[PDB]
Amino acid sequence: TVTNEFASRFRTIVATLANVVNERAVQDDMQKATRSCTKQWLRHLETQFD
Amino acid sequence: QVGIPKLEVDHISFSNVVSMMTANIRTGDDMAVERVNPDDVRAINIRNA
Amino acid sequence: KYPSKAIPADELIDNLHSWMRSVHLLHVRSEDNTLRYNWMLGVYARSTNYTTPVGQLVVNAPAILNYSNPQDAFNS
Amino acid sequence: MLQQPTGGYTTLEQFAFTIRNDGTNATPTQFLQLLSYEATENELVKKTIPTPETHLPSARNVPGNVYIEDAITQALFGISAQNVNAHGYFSRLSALALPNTSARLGLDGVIYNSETINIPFYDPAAVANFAATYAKLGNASTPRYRADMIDIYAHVGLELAGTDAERAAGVMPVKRAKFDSWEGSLISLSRDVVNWKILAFLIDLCSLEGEALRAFKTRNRDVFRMMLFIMSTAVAANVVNRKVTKRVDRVLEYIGVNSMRTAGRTATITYDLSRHEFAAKFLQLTFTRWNA
Amino acid sequence: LKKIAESFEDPSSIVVVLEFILFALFFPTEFNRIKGDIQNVLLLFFSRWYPVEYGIFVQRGATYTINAAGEFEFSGRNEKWDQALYLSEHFPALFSDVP
Amino acid sequence: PVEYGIFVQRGATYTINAAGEFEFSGRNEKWDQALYLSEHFPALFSDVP
Numbered sequence A: 001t002v003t004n005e006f007a008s009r010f011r012t013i014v015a016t017l018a019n020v021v022n023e024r025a026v027q028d029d030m031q032k033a034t035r036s037c038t039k040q041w042l043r044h045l046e047t048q049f050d
Numbered sequence B: 001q002v003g004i005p006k007l008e009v010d011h012i013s014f015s016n017v018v019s020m021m022t023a024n025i026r027t028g029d030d031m032a033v034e035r036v037n038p039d040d041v042r043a044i045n046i047r048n049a
Numbered sequence C: 001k002y003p004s005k006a007i008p009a010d011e012l013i014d015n016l017h018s019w020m021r022s023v024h025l026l027h028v029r030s031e032d033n034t035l036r037y038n039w040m041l042g043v044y045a046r047s048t049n050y051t052t053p054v055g056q057l058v059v060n061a062p063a064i065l066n067y068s069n070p071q072d073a074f075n076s
Numbered sequence D: 001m002l003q004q005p006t007g008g009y010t011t012l013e014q015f016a017f018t019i020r021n022d023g024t025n026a027t028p029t030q031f032l033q034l035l036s037y038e039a040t041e042n043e044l045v046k047k048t049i050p051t052p053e054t055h056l057p058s059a060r061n062v063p064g065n066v067y068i069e070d071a072i073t074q075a076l077f078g079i080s081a082q083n084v085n086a087h088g089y090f091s092r093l094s095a096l097a098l099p100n101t102s103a104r105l106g107l108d109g110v111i112y113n114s115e116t117i118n119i120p121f122y123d124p125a126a127v128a129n130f131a132a133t134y135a136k137l138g139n140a141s142t143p144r145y146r147a148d149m150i151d152i153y154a155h156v157g158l159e160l161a162g163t164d165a166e167r168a169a170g171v172m173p174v175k176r177a178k179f180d181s182w183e184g185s186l187i188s189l190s191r192d193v194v195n196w197k198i199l200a201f202l203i204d205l206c207s208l209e210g211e212a213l214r215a216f217k218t219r220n221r222d223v224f225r226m227m228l229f230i231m232s233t234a235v236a237a238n239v240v241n242r243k244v245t246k247r248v249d250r251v252l253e254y255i256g257v258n259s260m261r262t263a264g265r266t267a268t269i270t271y272d273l274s275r276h277e278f279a280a281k282f283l284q285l286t287f288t289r290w291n292a
Numbered sequence E: 001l002k003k004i005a006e007s008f009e010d011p012s013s014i015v016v017v018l019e020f021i022l023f024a025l026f027f028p029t030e031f032n033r034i035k036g037d038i039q040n041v042l043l044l045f046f047s048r049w050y051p052v053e054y055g056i057f058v059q060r061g062a063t064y065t066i067n068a069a070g071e072f073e074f075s076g077r078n079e080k081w082d083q084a085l086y087l088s089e090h091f092p093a094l095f096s097d098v099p
Numbered sequence F: 001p002v003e004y005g006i007f008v009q010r011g012a013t014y015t016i017n018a019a020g021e022f023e024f025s026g027r028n029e030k031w032d033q034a035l036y037l038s039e040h041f042p043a044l045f046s047d048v049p
């Protein structure tokens, strides 16, 4: 009635991708930023997809 | 027997096979490409190659 | 500082020590007993301050310095 | 389909191998008789040739009928060939490797994807034996499978310059070849050799077995030596002429020593690095079959 | 594939990986048609982000060929994919799903 | 400079361990405020002699 397997799959996908991006070691401060911004953006994409 | 090469001897031969490229070949025509510059100058390693 | 005479042992030791305190090679300690540490690549990376591609590889993946079979340490 | 005799395809007059010389179609043996060798202080000893790799390179999906004999002969003796490993159509030989493949190797030296009318072709079993080995030319460029291109030339020297005692010994002095010579003699020699239908030789070389094989190896020793000669001139460090009282002796230094040279020269064909790797591979395989 | 030139230095470059994941979802068929060509991009991704695992993987081989009885046979040899290989026996090895 | 090299060899940042011990990075990186919610702390303020 409510849950959608497709959307929820994309949700585990972006979960994995956020774990991937989170473990990405970086040296520059700006890269450090774009990492966390990238994570927020993934959390956005999941809602568009759902 | 293999044939005698024509330049080995002094007779003139007036019918000869000439290889020729066809319409499907073309040489020296200018050619198009997609150049793609690096996203950051500071990401470009010069060495150790 | 001492053009004509031996460096007094106290100064030699204290400077050598403070400089030893200054050094820290990147590494990922592990429990495998077969493992070694690629001293050459680590000290090199450190010397270039991790700017060379090897220094990048090391600053991001220090574990790459650890190795069992000696050759693979570089193949990696 | 061409039947293969109890001897090789090489027994057929259709496949005679003959360099031009003194205005006639000379056999390779009667050219090699002209050759004479000055010894030098250096010695060649022949190391064991490494066993060729088990791998047969993929015959990539190719719609076309590859002209293979032309590719091989030009890669070995061709005056102008280069980047021979760029295209990598040598791998195509492994299409012939399979049992009951549709593909045929024509006497034309072309690898047809399917049997086609009015094109005579070698017996498929023979070609399969031949492809099981020579398809490995297709991996002459890949780093894992490259042949040594220095030590192998020792064998070349022994198989060319070497006296029967030097051959039994496995060690001969490095030699310096020479012969009475016409202008452009090595260019003309190499071009007489590019026209040779060498797949006949390689196919009999891989298919024949028993006494029938050994009887081949004696009969075609001089042919193999002519191929080796052209390669030798291709890799020789220098190729001078000598005045000898209104006669000229061409002289190459040195037999059996690859100088690794790649800059072109008028006197002889030149190997680009790709031709070196290829020729090294070819020698690896061919000498492997030749000594078994 | 309409080739990307991505080097995958910045974290944001995960975007390109995502561009493929979505494509593999919305269009699995077309994806499967171009997947070797997208493996060439992914390899630049893995060699930066996961150099150790990348070395182990590529050491196993960049491609494989299923044989008789269905076993995979990885090449053991790193080599760039070309769409010339799509009609051949070879497969991109990122998609082998062999642990 | 000397004290600096000794300090920064230890690491620009640290993380408190679940066991409570500090664990310095051993790296010299510029801090970003994205790090403020991260596990890491600036090492100047560790108060570890």
Ligand SMILES: Nc1nc2c(ncn2[C@@H]2O[C@H](COP(=O)(O)OP(=O)(O)OP(=O)(O)O)[C@@H](O)[C@H]2O)c(=O)[nH]1
Binding pocket: C039, C040, C041, C043, C044
């Ligand atoms: N930078 C650096 N160079 C090294 C290291 N280890 C070996 N080398 C260099 O690599 C070169 C080759 O190594 P070796 O096979 O030991 O050569 P070597 O000349 O016999 O070295 P010696 O023991 O000094 O006689 C040597 O010249 C060393 O200077 C290292 O850990 N770091």
